[PDB]
Amino acid sequence: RCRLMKIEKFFPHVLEKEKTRPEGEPSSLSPEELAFAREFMANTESYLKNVALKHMPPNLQKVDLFRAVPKPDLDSYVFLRVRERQENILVEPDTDEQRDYVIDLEKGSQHLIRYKTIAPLVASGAVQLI
Amino acid sequence: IQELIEVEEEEEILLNSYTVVTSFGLAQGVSWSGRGGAGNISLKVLGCPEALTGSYKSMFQKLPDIREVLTCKIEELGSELKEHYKIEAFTPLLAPAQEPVTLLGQIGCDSNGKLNNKSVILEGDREHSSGAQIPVDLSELKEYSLFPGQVVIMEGINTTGRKLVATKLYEGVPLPFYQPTEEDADFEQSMVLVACGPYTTSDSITYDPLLDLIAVINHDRPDVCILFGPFLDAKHEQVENCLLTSPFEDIFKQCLRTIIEGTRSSGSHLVFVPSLRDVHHEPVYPQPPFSYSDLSREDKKQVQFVSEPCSLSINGVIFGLTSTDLLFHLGAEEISSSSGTSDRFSRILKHILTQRSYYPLYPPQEDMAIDYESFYVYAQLPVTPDVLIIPSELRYFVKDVLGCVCVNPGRLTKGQVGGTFARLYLRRPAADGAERQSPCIAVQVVRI
Amino acid sequence: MEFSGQRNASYPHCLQFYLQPPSENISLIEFENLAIDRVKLLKSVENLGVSYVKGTEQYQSKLESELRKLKFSYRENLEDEYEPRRRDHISHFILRLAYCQSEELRRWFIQQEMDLLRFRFSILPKDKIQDFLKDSQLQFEAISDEEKTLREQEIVASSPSLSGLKLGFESIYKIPFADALDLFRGRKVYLEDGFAYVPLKDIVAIILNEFRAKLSKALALTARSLPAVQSDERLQPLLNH
Amino acid sequence: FKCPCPTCGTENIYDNVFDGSGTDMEPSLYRCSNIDCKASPLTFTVQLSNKLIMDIRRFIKKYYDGWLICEEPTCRNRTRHLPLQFSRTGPLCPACMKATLQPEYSDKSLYTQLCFYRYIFDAECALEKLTTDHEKDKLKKQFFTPKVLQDYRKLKNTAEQFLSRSGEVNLSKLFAGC
């Protein structure tokens, strides 16, 4: 159920990313999920076009859902617990280089940090979100 | 103009919406270009005991410092040559000797004039000779080649203890060559451009030779460009009379900006070396690197500023860099009985490489303001270079001396008229080789 | 939760004892005026002396105004007073050479220094005393403090100058009679079996005495060793006039 | 310090921040020394800074040229070469072999000259050194606006760059004394 919420919420972005994907990298969608996403995209566009956009002046009948629909917010804060030791992780407060510094993640510890910095560790299986 | 064009574009769109002088290494016939710096190029600066990365406390030496510098150079290279020739000991210069005895010292002149075969003196070390001096007769030597400031070892007769009859002269010896890494093996044939100021005719600040060189760089797309000062010549007429309407430093920054923005499309990497003729920059040899700030991130990855002199590793190939006119300075001061085929510039280059220094001449030539402590710390070789770049007002050349490819590009202008620059090809020899061959395979000198 | 993220070492306190040479650089006008303003201060201490009695509140109130006006170190501040402290340190080293020109001038500036030190030691809060006595070589360990009330009775019976309250607020600790030398040889106060029941001001007297000894040795060194440094001496006549 | 005027070619001489004295004080950069010329040196401070660079480089070069002269008045030998045979009073001269050599233009001399160059364009210091408030007010209100002070400051900075490159008293060396 949770994966399906995220597909319905961000449909143009997941579709375009899968269309762009290079060979050998894993997909974010199973084949059935991709089928469902394609159906959802077509259905939504058709509804808006039939209800209002065909009546607009000729210069305004096109709209871009890729621009209208928001994007996933990777700067979200999360709690985590680490399963393998990691070293030289860079933390950036603010965005002035004079405040950058590095830390090390010891085995079995728990931390609160921005999702964007740790994203490869979650995909690799080094950490757990709690 | 442009703002109105963009306004009209917006208006039209909104309205319509509702409707060769010298060659070396068989360079000829081969095509001459680079990969625009796009290959596995790498640039690294070397120095011993350290590299000249920034400015120093100039203008404040004392004579014991100068004495110490000269003494240390005498004793260091004398110890190296003692071990090389397996000499047992050095006799003091003040000690009388009826039979020949071996002596360590430095060549000098008895007076402020140019050295000649009658004005020669030998000045000793502190360890064995207490810094004493002795006049020399060279006529009993079968051959010789000498200049002031040169550290030498001699064997001779000294019956008075106060005048030396030289019977044998021990030659100076260069350092070992560099040993390039595996990173210096993961690269392919590359092209290096060499040019030296003034980048102007000495009557006009119009920088026409600079634009010609920029066009050359864009046309050939070299991999590296080594650019030696003066970028704003103190001997230029408008500079000397101080008539220019902008500060010298701002004009120099404009010059660097012109090179960098003009050549950015080439991709070529840029190396900048100063000269004492750079009016805006420090007048003291060794000079620290220039100071500059207009670089974008691409330019920061492609542009590097270095000292005068400097030792640069280009893909593992060591380039010795000095804009100084040491060729003219030593040509005015070297003496010899080498009446055979040993060419004048060959002897000068051999002296540069054997004395292991980018300015072994002492006292220095009349324009060379030398800081001797910085010269001792920075102006000595870390290794024998593969390529020795040494511009001069004297005529351009290329020569293979002791295994080092010595290049004189001349200057980019002969005062009020156009001059010359140079181009080099690098390709490391095969790793199966039992002995070093030159990694520089071809060189040419070209007019601007 | 537990979170994650230079000149302090030079002068952790406003007090300083000139053990370490500041191995750095100076400007000509800088060392000149750093010393000369303190010459004015040396005269000013005794001008205040001829104005009224030494060390009173009138002295205290005027003296701190001199320091605020003259930008040298203070009753110790928590912000960057380390700059005034290093200025004080550097300028002290500079002051060694001017009035070494005569022993009477040496003694004159030494005397105003002792007056200034006595003032500073008079100002001290308790925390300053507690941390400086431990952070300095001036340790002077206390022994068996619970006995002080038996000496609250005995000293009070035995002393004209001391009193029961002084036992606590001029907090009493045990050290030998010799550290209270003027008090044993004058036989002024309760000392027993060679031991003195001592407040801070006796250790201040010892601080002043060893300061004088070390400073006198330094002044002898100033008279002897200095000639290599004497490439310039143009200020010395203006300083001795 | 000397420099030619770009407008009329006369060589102007500078010895202070000011020309004149007393109530007749004026900026040394205010007007050209040619009485028939309208030109103001505050309009060619760039050329003056350029000439200042050349002259300071000449004096630095003079220091580094290596000229030495003997102390003994019967010898007076002049040389560019430092003999390594030192003695209790420095390098022993090869002409007399009885007295030592000394520089013709020393580091202290060059430092003094660089300070002088800095001083003659240090308008803020010169204005503070005036002995009456009337002179300070007159010179500030009539001539030394922030623009004029910035011009003088550019010339001061031109000298200060060489001072910053020079070897500023080393505090550590004073402990070579006591």
Side-chain angles (χ1 to χ4, degrees):
Chain A
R1 285 198 289 268
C2 199
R3 285 183 59 79
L4 211 65
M5 307 201 314
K6 292 182 187 177
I7 292 163
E8 289 180 357
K9 194 183 298 183
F10 307 122
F11 58 94
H13 308 303
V14 297
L15 284 168
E16 189 273 353
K17 191 181 192 296
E18 172 54 28
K19 186 177 178 182
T20 308
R21 182 171 54 81
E23 290 296 343
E25 293 190 1
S27 184
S28 302
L29 301 170
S30 293
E32 294 83 0
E33 292 178 323
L34 176 55
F36 175 78
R38 284 178 170 168
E39 295 295 344
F40 196 90
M41 175 64 165
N43 181 34
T44 312
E45 285 185 310
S46 178
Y47 172 81
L48 289 173
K49 188 178 178 182
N50 288 1
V51 166
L53 304 188
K54 61 156 58 176
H55 308 302
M56 297 288 187
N59 189 235
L60 300 175
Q61 301 197 347
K62 301 296 187 179
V63 69
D64 187 2
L65 295 185
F66 192 87
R67 288 276 297 284
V69 176
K71 290 182 181 178
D73 189 26
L74 271 69
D75 280 313
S76 303
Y77 274 70
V78 296
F79 292 90
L80 67 92
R81 176 159 60 215
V82 307
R83 305 194 311 122
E84 297 182 39
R85 189 171 188 273
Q86 290 290 275
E87 192 164 77
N88 294 318
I89 298 297
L90 184 144
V91 186
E92 172 166 7
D94 204 324
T95 187
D96 295 351
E97 181 169 41
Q98 292 77 10
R99 293 192 178 206
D100 290 351
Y101 65 115
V102 301
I103 62 170
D104 302 322
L105 302 177
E106 298 301 334
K107 182 67 149 62
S109 58
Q110 307 187 145
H111 309 264
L112 172 56
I113 197 169
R114 275 196 297 125
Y115 176 81
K116 184 171 168 68
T117 62
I118 59 174
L121 299 182
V122 172
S124 181
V127 307
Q128 165 86 293
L129 307 177
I130 68 160
Chain B
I1 292 176
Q2 179 60 23
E3 296 173 37
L4 180 56
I5 292 168
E6 291 175 16
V7 162
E8 283 193 330
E9 281 175 9
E10 284 190 33
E11 287 172 359
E12 181 65 7
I13 290 163
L14 184 58
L15 293 162
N16 293 351
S17 71
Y18 297 90
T19 65
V20 179
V21 294
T22 286
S23 295
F24 166 89
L26 303 185
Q28 298 183 1
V30 184
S31 59
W32 273 91
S33 59
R35 300 188 181 187
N40 296 345
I41 307 300
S42 189
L43 298 172
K44 309 181 188 178
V45 174
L46 303 178
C48 182
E50 54 167 41
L52 181 40
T53 60
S55 296
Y56 55 86
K57 289 181 178 180
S58 64
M59 304 175 223
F60 217 70
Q61 302 179 117
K62 300 185 182 184
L63 301 187
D65 309 332
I66 308 180
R67 189 213 185 196
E68 182 75 333
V69 158
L70 294 163
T71 303
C72 287
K73 285 203 90 291
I74 291 163
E75 287 172 10
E76 286 166 28
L77 184 50
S79 182
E80 287 272 302
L81 296 172
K82 184 190 176 186
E83 181 174 323
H84 177 84
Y85 296 116
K86 300 183 181 178
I87 293 161
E88 298 191 335
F90 302 119
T91 296
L93 298 183
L94 298 170
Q98 297 290 348
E99 295 187 331
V101 288
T102 311
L103 311 169
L104 168 62
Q106 194 176 37
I107 294 296
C109 188
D110 67 6
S111 49
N112 300 301
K114 295 173 180 177
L115 185 68
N116 64 69
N117 65 304
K118 305 302 300 187
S119 67
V120 191
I121 62 158
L122 182 68
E123 179 161 55
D125 62 332
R126 185 177 174 189
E127 182 167 44
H128 303 83
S129 318
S130 305
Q133 299 185 349
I134 189 160
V136 189
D137 191 343
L138 304 169
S139 61
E140 287 75 15
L141 298 172
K142 65 180 184 288
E143 296 186 326
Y144 64 82
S145 168
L146 302 168
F147 67 97
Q150 185 199 28
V151 178
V152 299
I153 292 166
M154 288 176 162
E155 181 176 36
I157 288 162
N158 187 8
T159 64
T160 59
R162 294 186 176 185
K163 185 173 181 179
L164 175 56
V165 173
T167 64
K168 169 173 176 173
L169 169 60
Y170 292 77
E171 301 182 55
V173 177
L175 287 164
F177 288 88
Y178 194 67
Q179 297 293 351
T181 67
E182 306 307 320
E183 180 173 52
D184 307 316
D186 295 339
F187 89 98
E188 299 183 344
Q189 179 163 336
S190 301
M191 150 59 201
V192 181
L193 172 140
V194 159
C196 179
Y199 302 84
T200 52
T201 58
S202 65
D203 60 348
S204 182
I205 192 52
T206 43
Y207 283 112
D208 312 67
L210 195 80
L211 301 175
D212 295 336
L213 188 70
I214 288 160
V216 158
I217 289 161
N218 290 343
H219 178 274
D220 294 359
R221 293 196 68 195
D223 298 301
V224 184
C225 304
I226 316 180
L227 306 176
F228 296 79
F231 296 90
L232 183 57
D233 179 19
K235 299 190 176 186
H236 194 282
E237 180 170 42
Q238 296 180 286
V239 175
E240 184 172 36
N241 292 271
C242 303
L243 305 174
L244 298 173
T245 55
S246 294
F248 292 155
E249 180 178 336
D250 292 359
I251 293 172
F252 170 63
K253 287 173 184 173
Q254 179 174 356
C255 183
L256 292 180
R257 190 180 299 156
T258 304
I259 302 160
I260 289 158
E261 296 182 1
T263 60
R264 192 179 286 130
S265 57
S266 69
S268 306
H269 305 284
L270 308 183
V271 177
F272 285 97
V273 196
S275 176
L276 299 200
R277 284 167 72 170
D278 282 299
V279 67
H280 56 278
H281 198 46
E282 303 192 8
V284 190
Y285 182 93
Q287 296 171 293
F290 293 118
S291 179
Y292 194 62
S293 60
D294 302 334
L295 305 173
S296 69
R297 287 185 180 178
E298 298 179 14
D299 307 318
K300 287 180 183 181
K301 292 176 178 181
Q302 293 171 7
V303 181
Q304 184 166 14
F305 294 92
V306 302
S307 56
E308 171 60 20
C310 170
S311 313
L312 177 64
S313 178
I314 307 187
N315 311 347
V317 184
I318 305 311
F319 276 59
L321 315 179
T322 169
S323 73
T324 302
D325 214 316
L326 176 63
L327 298 172
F328 176 54
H329 304 161
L330 287 170
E333 296 286 3
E334 185 262 0
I335 61 169
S336 72
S337 56
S338 61
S339 299
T341 190
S342 187
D343 192 10
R344 190 175 190 170
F345 292 116
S346 299
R347 298 191 315 266
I348 289 164
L349 295 162
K350 178 176 174 178
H351 285 317
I352 288 161
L353 293 158
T354 50
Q355 297 287 311
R356 306 172 184 195
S357 189
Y358 297 110
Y359 207 96
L361 171 61
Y362 182 82
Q365 186 266 10
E366 297 186 325
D367 283 331
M368 288 297 299
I370 300 202
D371 188 285
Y372 303 102
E373 292 199 311
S374 287
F375 154 86
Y376 177 74
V377 174
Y378 305 114
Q380 320 311 327
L381 288 179
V383 291
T384 300
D386 296 299
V387 181
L388 172 53
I389 306 303
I390 179 162
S392 176
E393 293 283 1
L394 302 177
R395 191 178 183 197
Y396 46 80
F397 57 73
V398 184
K399 293 181 177 290
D400 178 10
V401 178
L402 301 165
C404 169
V405 179
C406 306
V407 181
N408 173 21
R411 308 291 185 172
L412 201 68
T413 53
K414 289 185 176 182
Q416 298 186 356
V417 297
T420 48
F421 69 96
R423 54 190 189 197
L424 310 85
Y425 262 134
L426 302 181
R427 188 205 294 174
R428 183 175 177 173
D432 298 337
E435 174 62 299
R436 178 186 161 282
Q437 299 184 0
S438 173
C440 179
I441 57 164
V443 179
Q444 294 191 311
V445 182
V446 184
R447 293 178 181 274
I448 190 59
Chain C
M1 296 205 210
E2 284 143 38
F3 305 111
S4 182
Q6 86 295 33
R7 282 191 284 110
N8 181 40
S10 304
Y11 308 95
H13 319 296
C14 67
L15 283 149
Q16 56 183 209
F17 242 103
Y18 321 110
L19 303 98
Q20 304 85 356
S23 300
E24 60 184 299
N25 306 282
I26 33 162
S27 171
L28 171 55
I29 298 171
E30 172 173 31
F31 80 78
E32 169 191 296
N33 286 261
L34 277 170
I36 285 173
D37 288 343
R38 296 172 78 95
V39 178
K40 305 167 190 168
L41 189 150
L42 295 169
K43 295 175 179 181
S44 301
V45 169
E46 306 308 332
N47 303 136
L48 195 56
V50 308
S51 303
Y52 37 63
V53 174
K54 293 295 198 170
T56 67
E57 166 272 340
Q58 305 85 71
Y59 232 89
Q60 297 159 28
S61 53
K62 267 57 176 174
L63 194 165
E64 170 62 17
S65 85
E66 312 309 334
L67 304 179
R68 296 205 98 179
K69 178 173 59 176
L70 294 166
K71 295 99 184 174
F72 284 110
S73 175
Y74 298 100
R75 66 138 307 287
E76 78 180 16
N77 266 102
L78 292 175
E79 62 183 4
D80 186 10
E81 209 213 337
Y82 304 90
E83 162 65 13
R85 291 165 200 175
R86 75 178 170 171
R87 286 198 295 244
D88 188 12
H89 194 93
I90 290 161
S91 63
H92 167 79
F93 277 117
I94 299 156
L95 276 190
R96 290 182 177 193
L97 331 176
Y99 295 112
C100 94
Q101 288 182 88
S102 178
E103 272 272 310
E104 194 275 335
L105 300 167
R106 294 176 200 178
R107 287 181 286 122
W108 168 82
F109 95 91
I110 287 165
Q111 283 301 123
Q112 32 255 229
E113 291 280 28
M114 299 320 192
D115 193 7
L116 288 158
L117 265 67
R118 280 178 182 278
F119 157 80
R120 199 273 158 285
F121 278 103
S122 84
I123 291 291
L124 291 170
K126 304 301 98 169
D127 63 351
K128 245 279 70 47
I129 296 161
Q130 292 158 8
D131 63 11
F132 184 69
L133 288 173
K134 297 294 183 175
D135 291 352
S136 185
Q137 298 80 6
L138 301 160
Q139 180 65 236
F140 302 108
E141 302 187 53
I143 297 175
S144 195
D145 299 342
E146 299 187 340
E147 301 175 25
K148 74 189 181 180
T149 192
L150 293 175
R151 300 188 172 91
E152 189 185 3
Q153 288 95 64
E154 269 281 24
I155 299 161
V156 166
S158 299
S159 314
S161 54
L162 265 62
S163 62
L165 56 149
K166 289 173 182 181
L167 190 105
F169 92 90
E170 305 194 308
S171 185
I172 286 286
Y173 48 97
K174 180 180 178 184
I175 64 177
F177 75 129
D179 297 349
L181 165 59
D182 194 59
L183 311 189
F184 86 72
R185 78 193 290 183
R187 299 172 287 251
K188 311 191 195 182
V189 71
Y190 175 95
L191 330 158
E192 119 279 305
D193 298 350
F195 277 90
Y197 301 99
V198 162
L200 177 62
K201 55 196 177 192
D202 294 341
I203 295 303
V204 176
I206 288 157
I207 285 161
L208 295 157
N209 290 346
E210 75 165 69
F211 171 53
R212 207 176 192 119
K214 289 168 175 178
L215 179 53
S216 180
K217 186 174 180 180
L219 285 160
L221 290 163
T222 307
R224 288 189 285 108
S225 323
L226 193 63
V229 179
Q230 292 182 225
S231 307
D232 183 8
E233 75 301 53
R234 289 170 295 162
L235 291 174
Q236 292 290 77
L238 307 178
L239 291 162
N240 66 41
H241 277 52
Chain D
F1 178 61
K2 304 186 184 178
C3 182
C5 175
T7 303
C8 75
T10 198
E11 185 159 40
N12 292 310
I13 306 180
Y14 306 90
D15 194 43
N16 274 296
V17 167
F18 312 118
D19 291 352
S21 61
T23 52
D24 296 336
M25 198 82 83
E26 67 191 318
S28 61
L29 297 178
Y30 174 60
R31 60 186 175 108
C32 188
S33 64
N34 178 8
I35 293 165
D36 294 342
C37 184
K38 184 62 173 178
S40 175
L42 287 160
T43 66
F44 52 90
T45 54
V46 169
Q47 292 82 348
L48 283 151
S49 174
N50 283 344
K51 185 58 164 58
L52 181 55
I53 285 161
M54 282 290 288
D55 288 1
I56 290 169
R57 286 165 53 101
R58 191 186 73 181
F59 276 98
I60 293 164
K61 186 187 187 186
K62 183 178 183 179
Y63 162 82
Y64 274 114
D65 280 337
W67 283 109
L68 312 176
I69 188 166
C70 188
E71 294 182 1
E72 165 51 52
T74 213
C75 178
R76 311 193 192 205
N77 179 46
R78 192 188 189 217
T79 182
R80 294 192 66 226
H81 180 280
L82 176 65
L84 302 180
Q85 185 172 359
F86 272 50
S87 67
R88 295 177 184 170
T89 57
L92 187 62
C93 176
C96 65
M97 298 258 66
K98 290 174 182 179
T100 57
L101 299 159
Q102 295 292 355
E104 291 200 326
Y105 181 67
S106 62
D107 58 340
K108 187 182 179 187
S109 304
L110 175 54
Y111 166 69
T112 306
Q113 184 62 46
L114 290 165
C115 287
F116 169 86
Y117 274 122
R118 176 264 297 159
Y119 158 74
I120 61 165
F121 299 118
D122 192 354
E124 296 166 25
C125 183
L127 289 160
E128 284 171 20
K129 280 179 173 185
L130 295 163
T131 56
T132 72
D133 297 342
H134 179 269
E135 289 158 313
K136 294 172 182 176
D137 290 354
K138 179 175 176 179
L139 288 156
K140 285 177 178 183
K141 288 177 176 182
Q142 187 169 6
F143 311 98
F144 286 90
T145 66
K147 182 65 176 182
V148 169
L149 283 161
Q150 184 177 14
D151 261 309
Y152 267 95
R153 192 177 298 124
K154 282 180 177 182
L155 289 156
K156 182 187 175 174
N157 291 351
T158 309
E160 291 271 28
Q161 82 197 8
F162 298 104
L163 281 164
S164 77
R165 293 158 180 173
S166 183
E168 187 73 344
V169 176
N170 190 334
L171 213 175
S172 323
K173 294 280 89 174
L174 92 76
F175 311 111
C178 319

